Design a protein around this nucleic acid. Structure first.
Lengths: 258, 187, 184
RNA sequence: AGAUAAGGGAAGUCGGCAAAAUAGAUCCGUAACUUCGGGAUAAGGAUUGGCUCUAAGGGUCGGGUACGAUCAACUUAGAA
RNA sequence: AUGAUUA
RNA sequence: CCCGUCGCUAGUACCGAUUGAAUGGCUUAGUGAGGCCUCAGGAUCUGCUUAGAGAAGGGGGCAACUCCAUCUCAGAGCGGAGAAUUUGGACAAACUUGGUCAUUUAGAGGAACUAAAAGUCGUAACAAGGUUUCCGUAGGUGAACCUGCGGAAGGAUCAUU
RNA sequence: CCAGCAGCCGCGGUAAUUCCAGCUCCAAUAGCGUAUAUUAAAGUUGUUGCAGUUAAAAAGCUCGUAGUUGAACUUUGGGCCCGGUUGGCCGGUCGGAUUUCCAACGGGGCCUUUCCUUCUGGCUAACCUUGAGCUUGGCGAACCAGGACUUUUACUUUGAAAAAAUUAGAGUGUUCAAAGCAGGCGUAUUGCUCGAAUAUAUUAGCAUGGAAUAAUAGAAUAGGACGUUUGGUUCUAUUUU
RNA sequence: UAUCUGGUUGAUCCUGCCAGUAGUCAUAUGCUUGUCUCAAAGAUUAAGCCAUGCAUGUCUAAGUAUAAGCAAUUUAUACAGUGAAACUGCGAAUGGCUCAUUAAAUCAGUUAUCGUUUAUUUGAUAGUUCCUUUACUACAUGGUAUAACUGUGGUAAUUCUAGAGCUAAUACAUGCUUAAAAUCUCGACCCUUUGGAAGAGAUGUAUUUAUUAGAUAAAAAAUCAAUGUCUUCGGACUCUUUGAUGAUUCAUAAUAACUUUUCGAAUCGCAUGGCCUUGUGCUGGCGAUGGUUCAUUCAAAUUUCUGCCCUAUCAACUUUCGAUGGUAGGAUAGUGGCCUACCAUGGUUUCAACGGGUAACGGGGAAUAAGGGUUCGAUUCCGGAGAGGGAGCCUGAGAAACGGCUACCACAUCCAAGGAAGGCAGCAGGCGCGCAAAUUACCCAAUCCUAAUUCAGGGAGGUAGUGACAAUAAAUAACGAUA
């Protein structure tokens, strides 16, 4: 439409932000950033509709502008910045550190953690190439662009980063039998320990994935996110850890605590 | 303006599409260049995304490569003598890509003399050693040697001067040289 | 631009209008249960049809089909929670079988009459709409309530009217002031 | 006997009588009606010089038990 | 050969 | 019970001289604005290079003579930007003229159809309907209709060893 | 037989249950009628699911292309086990849950002439490998990277995917309801906390287990498959010298 | 909640239609109208015309301020507080309105960009720019306006403008400033001949062209053109280096040149700190702005497969003057008949091409039902199209823009007749058209967006008013005694 869009109505904003269909006919458009529009949680909806730390967008803008807030160790004083997947946010006041991960019900969770657990994160490599002057480099899922990594690091691997620089603390390779996390689709929030995969040369490599109740499924290799080895996650995980129990067990569950 | 789309053409079955939209800016075209020789004129044009586009006109000199030697020198241009697309470009002397032209041959000759020390047409220890080592490769073939006798050498333009502002190309050798001299001599 | 508010009706007119059997039976029901509107009766029949559609399109499916299990158990639990269905008839065919009289007997107005605060369902109607009643610790002035039997335990009069105290009455004070002036 | 006439255009006159206008060639386009053969050059429009070029169209002699040499016509199309 | 309208 | 001509009233559509009329779309041809692109144009402003003099000022042979700045004015090139105007091209609005496609619409008159409480002429059909009806084709006549040739039973016969 | 009523039948021509008023009564109820379009009715569009002797509807009859449809047959059979679902003595818990179980149901595997792709590798696997009953050495997919022949579809199962809103539907006292996605619980001064499910989603496209049904090519004037073989032609090609 | 009924007959069974019946986010109208909650609303005929008034402007600590603007520095002699106008930089291409066009076209799901542009964000990223490169030149930093303003003014009118005098920049035009090594060329000279070489020019990025590398299933022998490592010159010979892709002339590196030469900070705010060779010496922090390349993100444009109403009283269509392909070139941001030159004659069709109509924008969806289905969908969300009909183009990353210009056509306005200014299918409001449709109101409080930016602006949006379009709940009466 004659140029880029700038506005966003409600009901075109995604579902998993859980924004209400009343309260004004406009929605927060994620300004461009290190994550996409849809698989991203803006800081306005974060502070205003996950924590209730503010009540009005002016107040959230007040907080972000007076710099009580900081994501990835930087203030980031824009009201509609995409706080995407896996990312870290640090609040000096209350000394909290939120981590942005998924839950099995298909929503952006709120993962409370400490300052040292904030100082490292995880990032799936999105691709690898050779930059100018013969400098091999890679680029992750959070717009982070990193130079001179290990030659062992190839595509679909994961890296653990220092957050004071963009350099690497260490890496994790891709192979059969590694703990993962899913990000995209019906499987949003699962945690499922690779059993095998399949190639289909020409497009759409698929991966067989199962969580610890033996329960399996299949997902696209660009929707998965590998988090380490079986047993230990490399980070802390939210309540449930990606299981997707039945509807009836959860009804009975709620009827047990009431 | 000149469009570049297919909403003004017919479909493949034979149906005049209807007029549905107005012409756009992301479907435009522009006039040809009709690039000539002498008194270098390079207008630049603003394009989609800034990204300037030096529309050559009247271009007098250009770059030319000799690929068996890998060298590349600046040279004048006598004129075009063959163009596969149109003899009109040949006659009217308009430089484009794939264009068979004649060049001065003086930098290649003098470079050959300075590099190998071997005469055409018709002392120090270091230069003598250099030429003695580089021998057994001054034996290219008859057609290029004859053209160096004449002082007018056949080159193929491989640039797109209306898109780049550079008439650049390479000398013909061997097979396509023979092909183009056959095409030229057809009478 | 305003996201449109969902709305959906809650009743349905008779297919065939003038059939004396239907009319005299539903008039009997309205004049016994203290109603003004064939609309309320149709509304109740529409609810019954909805719940039966759930029962029908569930019992078509085999047992241990988790959809059947979940939806039927939720339907049973809410229907027993409101009390129109019993506490020992949970086999889903009684849900197919239920009656408009059961829905009306679970309403508030006739409930008030069963508890004995009325002497007539019309007295219950005016008591409800004049707010001399509350089902919890909050006043309600709507007959169609569908009490949940916990409500039965929690019934009381209106705190802001006599028979549960705290004030003598509007027209009571009016007559008292009139007679105070009259005696003087 | 031959010609030309501003503005108008058959108002002249028995009547457009006389005169004008049209006119070759190439390309485009072509109605009703019909004995289906025609009507039809229907109607109606465009182009046409000079000069410098370019393209195609040929004849005959030549090959161990694809191509060359040589000779002469105007035809058509196209571009500056 | 035909027997006007309406009941 | 029923058919058709003819007669009166009203409606609906069709044919129809009028090279009918208007409205809209597509469009050959001709003229063709306007921007854009290319060949020039050159008002105008402006930087540099010298360029000699009307003659002050000071410094030095202190006597003629010399050095440079100065208000002044040609003259010459070396350039930068540069509008009006201009050649050629592609885009192509709009007008004129024809053609064509559709949508409504006028019309002398001609020939139909339908509706009308009690119009005229017959009586074709329903009984073997008083010449058994009907089908096709052809001719005829006020009108139904009649007649010829073949066909059917929906016939008035399921029937002559 | 006027005024007029009446969707349809019909009423009204001096005894109107139909017209216009009064009374009564009924229907729906802050709504009720009318006009026009549309859906159910409508099996009066017929795939489910119409009719064609006479009610409207079998072409005069035959040939014939596209289209639609198209005979039967090719692996069955049996055994042996394994483990999952359903109940089932004993209840060995005071309506939950256990063992050997009489029974059923589909699943996984081996053999019966049943290769239902194998070469390089590392796991050598189940290791004939056995040290005294917790030991050194069996045949690579059971882990993988690559080559390889991978004859085709239609169908069907499962999954990925189908933007929200909408529809169905879990939970929720908007005081009920339409709604909405909120709310609930404290020692009510520090505060704590479950939600915002799930399903449907035509055709088409992707992976996927199956092999009934329908076609689909293979080997017949053998340019037919395995061939450790044996030659010749051909190019490619790592290690060294 | 898988329902039937009245009407052809003297009566009967049937076919078959009419009529009844129920509903509609289906409209109009009538008669009546007390309440709470929620809320559509000039689409249908005219995408017919529009008065008036609004609807997009914008700054910090931080681009430029002598406002001859306002408070007061007294921490400040250049200002250093606040601050209109103006230059600059962004945005004005989003939003909002309508549904006229358009029937493989838009659109929906689903692919690709190994075929391309992309401001902004987000992550990385310019020791190499003095070219006889030694006097050729300021690098504790270089040149020019010009607005605003001063005053002179000119037209009847315009968001009309000229003449003269200043002055600014992150505006224009220019421009140097830090190592060390390493290969090529020349090449003085010794001359060696095994051949060694002083001294000199280049190398960053970007454009354009050409070349080379960008890889690698397995093991030994015979030599040479000249030994190559070090030598017992018997030869031990190992050591050696290149990533991704399903797949590339991919990323990337290096040779040889092209360029009228791209970028490589002459910008700005706070706090002002340390070494002493005791100085306007040298270093030093937190930021904002901009900048070449790459990746990312918001996009954009093309694009694969499948699907659209009625019509054969539309059966052949396309190709003059592009239709189908090929080659080459131009143009493009890029592929491609997108356009041109030449050549081959192809491409679509009863499996419904092509032509006509459409009270046709498509879809998510809406009404109605047991199932199957039929009808509608301008209309809140997604994608298209348009700004009275057409055509063109500037600025920009992004427009074929209409609350932007230029022209033509039909409309229409102000005229002191020379000329000037416009497109409500934006919010209100008016005429006409009709069966058919609201106030010329209040606010940026929320929801979001934009700017230099927390602060401003926003008829986007929210609020109230008209409102029986539809939905939810629900008053008008109840309870005693006496005949």
């Amino acid at each position: 439409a004659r140029g880029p869009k700038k506005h966003l109505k409600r009901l075109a904003a995604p579902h998993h932000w859980l924004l209400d269909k009343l309260s004004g006919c406009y929605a927060p458009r994620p300004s461009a950033g290190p994550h996409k529009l849809r698989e991203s949680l803006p800081l306005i909806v974060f502070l205003r509709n996950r924590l209730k730390y503010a009540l009005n967008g002016r107040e959230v803008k007040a907080i972000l502008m007076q710099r009580h807030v900081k994501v990835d160790g930087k203030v980031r004083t824009d009201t509609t910045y995409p706080a995407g997947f896996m990312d870290v946010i640090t609040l000096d006041a209350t000394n909290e550190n939120f981590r942005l991960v998924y839950d099995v019900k298909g929503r952006f969770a709120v993962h409370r953690i400490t300052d040292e657990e904030a100082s490292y994160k995880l990032g799936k490599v999105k691709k690898v190439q050779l930059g100018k002057k013969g400098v091999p480099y890679v680029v992750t899922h959070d717009g982070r662009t990193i130079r001179y990594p290990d030659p062992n690091i190839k595509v679909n691997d994961t890296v653990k980063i220092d957050l004071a620089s963009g350099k690497i603390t260490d890496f994790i390779k891709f192979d059969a039998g590694k703990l993962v996390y899913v990000t995209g689709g019906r499987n949003l929030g699962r945690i499922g320990t690779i059993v095998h995969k399949e190639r289909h040369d020409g497009g759409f490599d698929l991966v067989h994935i199962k969580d610890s109740l033996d329960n399996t499924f299949v997902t696209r290799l660009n929707n998965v996110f590998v988090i380490g080895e079986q047993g230990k996650p490399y980070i802390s995980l939210p309540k449930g850890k990606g299981i997707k129990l039945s509807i009836a067990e959860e009804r009975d569950r709620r009827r047990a605590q009431q | 303006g000149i469009s570049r789309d297919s909403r003004h053409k017919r479909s493949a079955t034979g149906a005049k599409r209807a007029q549905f939209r107005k012409k756009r800016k992301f479907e435009l075209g522009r006039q040809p260049a009709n690039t000539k020789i002498g008194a270098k004129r390079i207008h630049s044009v603003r394009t989609r995304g800034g990204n300037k586009k030096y529309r050559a006109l009247r271009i007098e000199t250009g770059n030319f490569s000799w690929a068996s030697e890998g060298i590349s020198k600046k040279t004048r241009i006598a004129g075009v003598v063959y163009h596969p697309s149109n003899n009109e470009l040949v006659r009217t002397n308009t430089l484009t890509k794939a264009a068979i032209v004649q060049i001065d041959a003086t930098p290649f000759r003098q470079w050959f003399e300075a590099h190998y020390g071997q005469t055409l047409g018709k002392k120090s220890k270091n230069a003598e050693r250099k030429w003695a080592a580089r021998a057994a490769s001054a034996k290219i073939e008859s057609s290029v040697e004859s053209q160096f006798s004449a002082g007018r050498l056949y080159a193929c333009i491989s640039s797109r001067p209306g898109q780049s502002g550079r008439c650049d190309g390479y000398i013909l050798e061997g097979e396509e040289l023979a092909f183009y001299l056959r095409r030229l001599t057809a009478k | 631009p305003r996201a449109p508010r969902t709305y959906s009706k809650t009743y349905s007119t008779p297919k065939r209008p003038y059939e004396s059997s239907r009319l005299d039976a539903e008039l009997k029901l309205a004049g016994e249960f203290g109603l003004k509107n064939k609309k309320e009766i149709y509304r109740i029949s529409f609810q019954l049809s909805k719940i039966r559609r759930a029962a029908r399109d569930l019992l078509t499916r085999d047992e241990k089909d988790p959809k059947r299990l979940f939806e039927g158990n939720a339907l049973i639990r809410r229907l027993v929670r409101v009390g129109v269905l019993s506490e020992d008839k949970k086999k889903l065919d009684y849900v197919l079988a239920l009656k408009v009289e059961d829905f009306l007997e679970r309403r508030l107005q006739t409930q008030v009459y069963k508890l004995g605060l009325a002497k007539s369902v019309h007295h219950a109607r005016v008591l409800i709409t004049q707010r001399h009643i509350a089902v919890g610790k909050q006043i309600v002035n709507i007959p169609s309530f569908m009490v949940r039997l916990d409500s039965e335990k929690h019934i009381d009069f209106a705190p802001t009217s006599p028979f549960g105290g705290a004030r003598p009455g509007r027209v009571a004070r009016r007559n008292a002031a009139r007679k105070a002036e009259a005696s003087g």
